[PDB]
Amino acid sequence: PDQRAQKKGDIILGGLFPIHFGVAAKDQDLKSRPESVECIRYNFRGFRWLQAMIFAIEEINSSPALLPNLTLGYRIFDTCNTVSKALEATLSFVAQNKIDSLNLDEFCNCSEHIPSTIAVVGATGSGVSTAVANLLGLFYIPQVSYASSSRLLSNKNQFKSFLRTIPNDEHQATAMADIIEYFRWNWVGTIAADDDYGRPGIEKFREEAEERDICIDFSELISQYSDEEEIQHVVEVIQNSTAKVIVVFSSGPDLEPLIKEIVRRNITGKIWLASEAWASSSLIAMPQYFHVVGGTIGFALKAGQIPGFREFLKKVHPRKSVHNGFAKEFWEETFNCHLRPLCTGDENISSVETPYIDYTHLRISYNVYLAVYSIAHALQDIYTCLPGRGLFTNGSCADIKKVEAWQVLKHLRHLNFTNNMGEQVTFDECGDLVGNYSIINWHLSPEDGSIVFKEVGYYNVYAKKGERLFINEEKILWSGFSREVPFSNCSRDCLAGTRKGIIEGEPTCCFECVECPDGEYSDETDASACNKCPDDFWSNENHTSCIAKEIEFLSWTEPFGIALTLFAVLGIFLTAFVLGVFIKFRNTPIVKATNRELSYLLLFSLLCCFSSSLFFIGEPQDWTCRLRQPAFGISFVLCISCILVKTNRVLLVFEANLQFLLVFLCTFMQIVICVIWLYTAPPSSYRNQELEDEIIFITCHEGSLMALGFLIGYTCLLAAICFFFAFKSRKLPENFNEAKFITFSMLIFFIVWISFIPAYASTYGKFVSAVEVIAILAASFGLLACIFFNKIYIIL
Amino acid sequence: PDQRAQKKGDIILGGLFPIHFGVAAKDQDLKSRPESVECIRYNFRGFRWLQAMIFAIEEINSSPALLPNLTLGYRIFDTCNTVSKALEATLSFVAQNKIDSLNFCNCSEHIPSTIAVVGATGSGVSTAVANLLGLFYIPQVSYASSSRLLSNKNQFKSFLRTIPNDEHQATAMADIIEYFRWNWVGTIAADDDYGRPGIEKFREEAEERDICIDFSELISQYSDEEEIQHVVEVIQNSTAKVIVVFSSGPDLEPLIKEIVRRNITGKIWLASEAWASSSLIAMPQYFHVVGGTIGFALKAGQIPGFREFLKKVHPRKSVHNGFAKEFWEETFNCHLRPLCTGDENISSVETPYIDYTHLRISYNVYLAVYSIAHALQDIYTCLPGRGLFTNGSCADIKKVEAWQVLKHLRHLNFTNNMGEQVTFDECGDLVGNYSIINWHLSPEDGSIVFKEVGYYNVYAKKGERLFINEEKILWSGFSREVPFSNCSRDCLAGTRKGIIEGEPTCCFECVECPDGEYSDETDASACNKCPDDFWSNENHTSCIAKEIEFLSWTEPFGIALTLFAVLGIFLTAFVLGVFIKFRNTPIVKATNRELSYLLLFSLLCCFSSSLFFIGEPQDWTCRLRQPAFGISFVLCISCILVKTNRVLLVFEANLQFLLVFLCTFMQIVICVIWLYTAPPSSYRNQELEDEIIFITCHEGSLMALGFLIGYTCLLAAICFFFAFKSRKLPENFNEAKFITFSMLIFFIVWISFIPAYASTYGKFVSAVEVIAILAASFGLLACIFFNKIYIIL
Ligand SMILES: O=C(O)[C@@H]1Cc2c([nH]c3ccccc23)CN1
Ligand SMILES: O=C(O)[C@@H]1Cc2c([nH]c3ccccc23)CN1
Ligand SMILES: *[C@@H]1O[C@H](CO)[C@@H](O)[C@H](O)[C@H]1NC(C)=O
Ligand SMILES: *[C@@H]1O[C@H](CO)[C@@H](O)[C@H](O)[C@H]1NC(C)=O
Ligand SMILES: *[C@@H]1O[C@H](CO)[C@@H](O)[C@H](O)[C@H]1NC(C)=O
Ligand SMILES: *[C@@H]1O[C@H](CO)[C@@H](O)[C@H](O)[C@H]1NC(C)=O
Ligand SMILES: [Ca+2]
Ligand SMILES: [Ca+2]
Ligand SMILES: [Ca+2]
Ligand SMILES: [Ca+2]
Ligand SMILES: [Ca+2]
Ligand SMILES: [Ca+2]
């Protein structure tokens, strides 16, 4: 390495910064002796970090309070983000230690003029720094990095002298998961880089997503040296996916070919998530690409303050700066000339617009500044060590004249001081720091069309999980110009009345919506299953909620019921035209039956025949006391018996007072059978019919219907017997044709049941009570009309 | 590095082998100057590999057909599975190139420079060594590094290997998992460069093949007790019986010991190639925890004369090999506490150094050494004018450089002692077959043995690369039944799936298919919808056909209707069939025999129409039952109604015979007009009454039938009005009274069956209609002919 930044001093430090983005991308066939690689691109941020470190060292050497008489030198080389260059620089650093503490088999002699460094500033990448630390751990030389946040460097078993001044990015995955949870999504992507920074950083994110039940569509890995095949495959995978959110864990140059290919293919409508590595890189954030990476949300560190730095940055000159060997190359790259046209030392560094001269926040430079002062404070603590109170064995103390690397590492292990801003800086036993992570968004400046970063929130690491992040949605512009929150889900959420259904070969986050069948209802949206038991209710047409069932039965409240009751009471009134108001019964001339008894009985007999029809009307169980367990046969057992005794009285004169006792004996069998039935045998009722539809049915199904059939058959047989007995003498019309019309009156009763048997068998709306009551009422009207034909001839 | 194996020569080769499994674990507080670490336990497999390399070098140096005038030396250090120890050896190897490349430094010229370095046994150690060796373009060949991270040529330029990569092993394990009926498995990996890269591919394959993973954990050799306890608790609190392990011997040893201490059984263990045959875990005392373990092994090789060279090791005569002094002490438990002598036997003590059945890593080392020798021979034997360098130039064997050796090694193709061809790929990788082994218990020795139960191919198409013999696999060491490892039992027939919240797709519930649809396959995603003409079974297994009821003639009610119809036909033919004498008969008032056969055939046609009314609407394709609706209401009644018309005409006052056919004319023309206006159709839908399909008839403009019935009723009413004043007096065989009584019977029959028409049992409207028609016709014929059938003549 001919180019170097070397300054002499009593104590020598080591530094490694990236000045070039990469090396020549050429393959060697090894046909001849290989040569060293050559740089292709130039970096300006590394020069800024180098200048900041030089300024910090100079301020240390210019502060008598920090160090009275100690002068510190430095040796800085270039890495170019290459493992080989950093390994060569580290080997050159540890040559004095290598010749002495190593290679004991053979005698190795070297010049004493070369100095020995006490510490080496770590590299930027997480892979190069890993190799540098692995090689440095043999000699116990401390190494402090400023940009490595990989977890693989946190293992103290493999690395013993590695420290970092950048907060660990393990909380970055948690913050991204919380961001995804806040803007509720379930379909996301995953793109990482094949290195030591991307692969370990995606496992934690995937674990957090799985813990939060977040589905991942595709996961891909990219690299800077990959050719067109992998880039095309990744582009095809991205295009063939419906995920609108992509998580990217990569660097600037690593992601540059993918961004260029996407821009060439004009792929838009995607959301880009940026980590701290590439949230502010100038290689990706360009106006020409603003239509592909617009509205990008990224992570950034906490800004620092370095007084007297802007003025120092303008003092660089390629002629009066002999200590710095990179000034000439920086000048040539900035002014784009040779030292084609000749260039003198009379330009202005602030004319050309380059990132070296303009900046908004110093994060990595502040990290290097803090590391340099941490080393200075460790040296000061070594100098100020008091006898009798030390960190070595038996209370020993070190000598400032002869300081070894292991003593510096031991003193750096237990370090605590105050920052220039009043903060407290100390090193944890894992060699890691804790700091805030900030959220930034990309916007377009209307003035000159330049990409700018705006703060729209922050992440806290000193609070309990759940409320560690704050965000302001009103200041976030999605896709660069859109304000509404984009919709990125595998499928639409199920609405009310629909349930979920599995699709074969698909994850849990993807499903289908299926309408629930009858009898099932669901109120909450996206319900796993619908309620099955409506608690004696019915499912609605839309299955939104439950509906109470309807009770349908014959009642007097309905117009049909009130009309039937009015007809019944009218019939009761029409049989009271003699019962209620009676004509003279003494020496009655119209009827030969002078005696009031056995003839006045027919009045209240017909009254009971009419009144008994009111048992069937209304609900069977409407009243508790009047539950009417016997309902059917009571009407028959009295009315048929009265008809039979009347027919017997009529026939005794023609076919054939002890008659009153004689008529009752024949009908006594009906009454004793009914009394046995209605008391000894307790009838029941059927509460609900077959429980299928929303229309419920109530009915009174008397127990032991065979007894009812038997008693009806007995009554019919007795009626037929009396009809047959009356038939033999009804042909001859005598005595006001009395016997001639009773036969027709009771034949009306017979033909009522003949004409209403299909109504008994089948009825509309389960109204067997209605047909029964109308049949018995019509029979009662017929009997009443044809039983009092003698009164219409003569009033009295 | 005082402990080393050195032999000088014209050409020097480097080598690294693991002689110890690790180093002493102690924290450094930096109170004083740190000292070098020490290795605690000895290893015999690394010593066997070193002996194999020495034997190969000696065989090459004692062969005239290979490098006849060249002498080969070696320089081998110790690694102890430590990164720092290997880095020290790597730095010592590149001491000569340090002055030439870096930066002045003066060094003695007596020290030689190695041209090749044998790769390390580990993965991260090999990566660290190759990172430093790549600067000087020094070729390096490894024998046990199978990590994919070494397959990147951009970072590594002088790395070669003779072992298949881990991608094939992961694919084979995925195929094994897919072969068995398991979908709920675990995952355990080691925090190193061998385990983590070897689990991403396996997880991707499992996700592609629709395989769920229960838990994933990382373990390490230096992990404390808390991590081990957490891993054990996670494993115990799981329902998975199959566990995938990607770790080495010492890495997995603490976890195995902790599991044994807790006496955890009933688990299926899958072993990677790294620990499928390690003696640190395969112990009888742990057998009841690792019984029936399936592991992967490579293809063994044959090295004639190896055992004889192994059985002649001596700590005194082996001046070149300085590692025998410690090996003798370790294998005999002595030192040079009880004093020892150089007269013991090596065969006696049972050690893995001499007790072995196959050689896999040693064969790899032999192949690597022979590949290097073949490259050197090709360098020596190259002819001018056809060299691979620029302008056809060829190198000189007197002065050889590392880059030339690497270039010739990149293009290598030779043959083995077993008649096999060995080449090098563009990435320096090799391919080979795989073997599957199972762990069994010796019946008398009591030790763990390996049995071959199958193999995996790499030269065949996808899906036809694995062969498994189930008749030799013994699960759990003694069990025979195939283990069952599923999240939940599969749904039976007629039962569909149901989702559980916050659970993977591999876990679900079984819910019975509701009524109206069926599923005839197990683990059905959804219940298949039944067809229109089929209904779901009681058990919902499949669909069943429905039934149709149409009052067939074979029905008891149908045959009853038939028997009444034929009885009526016979009774009416008793009068019509026989031509009884009607000469000067006084039964009929009219002398002419006409106006009597009219009724006789009208009743017959009415009976025929009533009989034809029943049956299917489409029983006969010639004509539908439509006339059965019409004529039965006009031909049956109006022709009979002619007698009532003539008798009312007589009461009002061969001349009126033609004047009483008008009613039939108007009724038939109205029927024809209705039929042509909107012919009746047939309704065969289910009408949402029930699941049973019913057949019925529907006609447009149904009010026409009501109007026809109303016209008939009005005609009968006007007949009653006309005959009311004539029926009071009885005369002429009481014909008027009997006709009035017959028509009253007709009215009472028509109005008696009104609620049956309104509602009928079983939707048998046709049965009600035919019953009413027959009853009315029978009463009519029995009552109008009351005096015409009382006496035959
Ligand atoms: O660990 C790593 O590799 C990244 C490197 C990196 C970070 N921030 C940067 C800014 C510019 C350039 C590089 C970086 C943070 N950690
Ligand atoms: O790459 C690695 O780290 C492993 C190391 C290893 C393999 N086979 C072994 C047998 C014994 C000891 C160690 C090993 C295969 N690849
Ligand atoms: C980080 O943000 C929180 C939020 O108030 C707070 O602790 C502080 O302002 C920031 N810095 C540190 C060191 O916490
Ligand atoms: C997307 O799916 C998630 C799954 O939990 C859900 O919470 C979210 O509401 C869905 N998005 C929309 C817009 O409904
Ligand atoms: C376990 O699940 C798999 C998933 O397809 C299935 O093939 C297998 O039959 C199930 N096991 C049993 C015993 O049914
Ligand atoms: C690997 O197995 C296959 C099939 O059994 C066959 O090619 C041969 O036996 C093996 N091949 C090699 C190169 O050993
Ligand atoms: Ca770097
Ligand atoms: Ca970070
Ligand atoms: Ca799938
Ligand atoms: Ca090793
Ligand atoms: Ca392998
Ligand atoms: Ca979960």
Side-chain angles (χ1 to χ4, degrees), chain B residues 193-213:
Chain B
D193 291 331
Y194 173 57
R196 288 186 268 108
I199 203 61
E200 200 62 34
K201 182 71 175 178
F202 167 73
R203 183 180 63 83
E204 156 192 350
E205 294 293 328
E207 294 294 328
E208 162 196 325
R209 290 161 155 78
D210 284 307
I211 295 163
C212 283
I213 298 170

Side-chain angles (χ1 to χ4, degrees), chain B residues 239-344:
Chain B
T239 53
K241 284 169 87 217
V242 175
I243 294 183
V244 169
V245 171
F246 264 71
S247 66
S248 70
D251 291 331
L252 198 65
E253 189 177 357
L255 177 80
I256 293 298
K257 287 183 178 180
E258 186 80 14
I259 287 164
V260 169
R261 198 200 61 77
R262 290 220 203 167
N263 210 30
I264 285 159
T265 68
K267 287 303 173 194
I268 294 295
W269 295 103
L270 293 174
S272 176
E273 190 276 331
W275 75 287
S277 297
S278 66
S279 70
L280 270 158
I281 305 169
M283 284 181 166
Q285 61 185 357
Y286 308 165
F287 186 64
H288 70 72
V289 192
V290 294
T293 291
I294 298 169
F296 281 66
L298 288 160
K299 192 205 212 151
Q302 315 273 325
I303 308 170
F306 191 32
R307 181 176 297 261
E308 286 84 4
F309 174 69
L310 283 187
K311 289 193 290 185
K312 62 175 70 176
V313 60
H314 200 272
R316 185 177 65 247
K317 294 185 288 293
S318 297
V319 57
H320 280 177
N321 193 1
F323 282 93
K325 199 259 177 179
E326 182 65 26
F327 155 76
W328 204 267
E329 295 185 349
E330 287 277 333
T331 197
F332 279 122
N333 199 38
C334 60
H335 70 99
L336 306 95
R337 191 188 55 255
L339 183 63
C340 53
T341 181
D343 275 335
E344 315 162 342

Side-chain angles (χ1 to χ4, degrees), chain B residues 283-288 291-292 438-450 474 477-478:
Chain B
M283 284 181 166
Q285 61 185 357
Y286 308 165
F287 186 64
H288 70 72
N438 206 20
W439 290 20
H440 294 269
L441 194 72
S442 189
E444 68 269 12
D445 204 10
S447 61
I448 309 191
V449 297
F450 309 111
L474 289 185
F478 64 94

Side-chain angles (χ1 to χ4, degrees), chain B residues 771-793:
Chain B
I771 284 294
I773 287 290
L774 276 296
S777 46
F778 264 108
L780 189 56
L781 63 88
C783 285
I784 66 172
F785 287 171
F786 209 100
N787 286 87
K788 261 182 260 194
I789 79 182
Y790 193 72
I791 61 171
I792 184 60
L793 268 74

Side-chain angles (χ1 to χ4, degrees), chain B residues 656-709:
Chain B
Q656 50 89 29
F657 171 67
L658 272 75
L659 266 66
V660 286
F661 285 102
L662 297 172
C663 175
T664 298
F665 196 79
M666 283 74 75
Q667 283 207 344
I668 201 64
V669 70
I670 292 299
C671 274
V672 166
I673 287 312
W674 173 64
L675 191 69
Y676 281 125
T677 303
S681 77
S682 315
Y683 188 84
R684 65 179 299 275
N685 195 54
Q686 289 73 240
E687 75 258 10
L688 311 165
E689 183 178 1
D690 62 331
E691 88 268 14
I692 296 169
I693 175 171
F694 280 162
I695 179 59
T696 177
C697 60
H698 190 246
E699 64 278 359
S701 199
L702 59 89
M703 283 73 74
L705 281 82
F707 275 105
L708 178 58
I709 299 173

Side-chain angles (χ1 to χ4, degrees), chain B residues 756-772:
Chain B
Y757 275 136
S759 58
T760 181
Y761 38 86
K763 299 288 97 176
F764 287 136
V765 184
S766 290
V768 162
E769 179 168 354
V770 68
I771 284 294

